[PDB]
Amino acid sequence: RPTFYRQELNKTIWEVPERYQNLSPVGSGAYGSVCAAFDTKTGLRVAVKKLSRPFQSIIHAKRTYRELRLLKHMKHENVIGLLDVFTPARSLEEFNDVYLVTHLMGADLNNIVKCQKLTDDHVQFLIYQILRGLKYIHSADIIHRDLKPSNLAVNEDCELKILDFGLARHTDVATRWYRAPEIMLNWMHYNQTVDIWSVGCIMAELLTGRTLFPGTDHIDQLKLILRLVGTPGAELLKKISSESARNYIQSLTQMPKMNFANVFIGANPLAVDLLEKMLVLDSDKRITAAQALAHAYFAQYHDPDDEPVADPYDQSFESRDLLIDEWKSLTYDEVISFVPPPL
Ligand SMILES: O=C1c2ccc(Nc3ccc(F)cc3F)cc2CCc2ccc(OC[C@H](O)CO)cc21
Ligand SMILES: CCCCCCCCO[C@@H]1O[C@H](CO)[C@@H](O)[C@H](O)[C@H]1O
Ligand SMILES: CCCCCCCCO[C@@H]1O[C@H](CO)[C@@H](O)[C@H](O)[C@H]1O
């Protein structure tokens, strides 16, 4: 147990072990806020996230445990991971606060457009890194569900890491634009290629410099999607159980599929080809993360000997209805049992 010190930053109070110096606010999300700091022990620049009100309620309590159990498991260079987790508290009885530490990264993909086009070779490297971490996350049976630009952390080296949650507020971007259609129609079931649609939307935005589907609401969103990929045929229509949605889609001016080739004019025809394969309405035919790595577009990066899969991940807790106290005590066990990686 190290020596802690306190500081106030933006009316958040921070209590941290002194190894972390020069705390500097970077921003906040719904579930906590994030500081940049210097880790004197390791010599690295780090991001420390103070969870906000971890244990306000069964929802929060279970979310905190989820996050701690999630980030403890991720060990892959395209997936954010844990350098440290700590609590200022000395017993379970006084346990209230969770801090999580990771590599400082310095920006998010939202922040490294400036509304602008990147060259074909950054796109390749970027979408590559995303898919590479995606292969890994999916191999653990996890589905991200909310892959968007702000959920992607990138450094000066154009090295990229998938965040669990990115920042809504920066000290110094709508979900729906990137959501697979099956999720917008509240399908009670999906597969992992839900994230692939998202990668498609991101990719598209990088090559063109503009959002693929800037829907003003969830209905507008679908209208936009259908315009590009065309209204669904019968074999897809047979699969929607809900009359209201079916009736809506069928009540639409039926639209043909566009020539992606005419819409992504200018782009590496290989790029274009990958898009076709990611942005298919029917989740059964979208290319997977592991398949897309083998798509020619990534030839200068692909290496199946260096595209690792994850240890299997116990998600049984996801189905349990426990008390705040139990959820709390589980999280605590996880703070306590934390093994840091080697430097
Ligand atoms: O690196 C970044 C990062 C890192 C982590 C994290 N959440 C998180 C997740 C898990 C964990 F354990 C600890 C955590 F902090 C969220 C982000 C947000 C994207 C971002 C945006 C801007 C940045 O720098 C602005 C400065 O001004 C320097 O230029 C840095 C980062
Ligand atoms: C760190 C790599 C693992 C990524 C897993 C992301 C875990 C976040 O789970 C999130 O909870 C939200 C709140 O209801 C959901 O709506 C989002 O779809 C989901 O991404
Ligand atoms: C934009 C409106 C079109 C809606 C079509 C979305 C197609 C969703 O795709 C469906 O995913 C299901 C699981 O989620 C699978 O059981 C189906 O086979 C698959 O077609």
CA separation for the pair 74, 274 (Å, rounded): 27
Helix H or strand E segment including 20: strand 20-28
In this structure, the residues whose C-beta lies within 6 A of any atom of ligand 3 are 181-182, 185, 187, 189-190, 222, 225-226, 232, 236, 239, 249, 281-284
User: Which residues precede gaps in the chain, with C-N > 2.5 A?
Assistant: 172
Alpha carbon distances (Å) from 258 to 90, 193, 199, 267, 295: 61, 22, 19, 16, 22
Alpha carbon distances (Å) from 212 to 20, 59, 103, 160, 163: 41, 33, 31, 21, 22
Q: Residue holding tokens 């379970």? A: 92
- Residue 49 CA to ligand 1 centre (angstroms): 8
Q: Which among 170, 174, 187, 161 has a CA at the least distance from the CA of 281?
A: 187
Q: Which CATH architecture has domain 107-309?
A: Orthogonal Bundle (1.10)
Which are the catalytic amino acids?
Answer: 164
Helix axes 120-139, 194-208, angle to 10 degrees: 170
CA separation for the pair 133, 220 (Å, rounded): 31
- Residue 45 CA to ligand 1 centre (angstroms): 11
CA dihedral 279, 280, 285, 289 (to 10 degrees): 10
Q: Which among 7, 21, 207 has a CA at the least distance from the CA of 119?
A: 207
Question: Which experimental method was this entry solved with?
Answer: X-ray
CA separation for the pair 85, 48 (Å, rounded): 9
Chain centroid, CA 276 distance in Å: 22
Domain positions in the chain are 14-106, 107-309
CA separation for the pair 94, 88 (Å, rounded): 9
- Residue 21 CA to ligand 2 centre (angstroms): 30
Q: Do domains 14-106 and 107-309 have the same CATH topology?
A: no
DSSP 8-class letter at 178: G
Q: Which among 171, 170, 42, 185 has a CA at the least distance from the CA of 101?
A: 42
Q: Pick the ligand that lies closest to the CA of residue 285.
A: 3
CA separation for the pair 180, 183 (Å, rounded): 6
**Interior CA angle at 282 toward 278 and 288, to 5°?**
40
| Residue 190 assigned as binding residue | no
Query: Length of the chain, please?
Result: 343
Q: Which among 1, 58, 117, 23 has a CA at the least distance from the CA of 320?
A: 58
Q: Where are the alpha helices (DSSP H) in the chain?
A: 58-71, 120-139, 181-184, 194-208, 218-229, 234-237, 243-250, 260-263, 269-278, 289-293, 324-336
Is the Cα dihedral 113, 119, 120, 124 positive or negative? Answer: negative
In this structure, the residues whose C-beta lies within 6 A of any atom of ligand 2 are 70, 74, 79-80, 137, 142, 144-146, 162, 164
Q: Which tokens hold the place of 62?
A: 């279970």
What superfamily in CATH does domain 14-106 come from?
Answer: Phosphorylase Kinase; domain 1 (3.30.200.20)
267 lines ligand 1 (CB under 6 A): no
Asked if 288 contacts 192 with a C-beta cutoff of 8 angstroms, the reply is yes
Of the chain, the end-to-end C-alpha distance in Å amounts to: 20
Chain centroid, CA 228 distance in Å: 25
CA separation for the pair 225, 192 (Å, rounded): 19
| Residue 33 assigned as binding residue | yes
- Residue 118 CA to ligand 3 centre (angstroms): 32
The percent of the chain in helix, strand and coil, each rounded to the nearest 5, is 40, 15, 45
Question: Would you tell me how many other CB atoms lie within 10 Å of the CB of residue 44?
Answer: 15
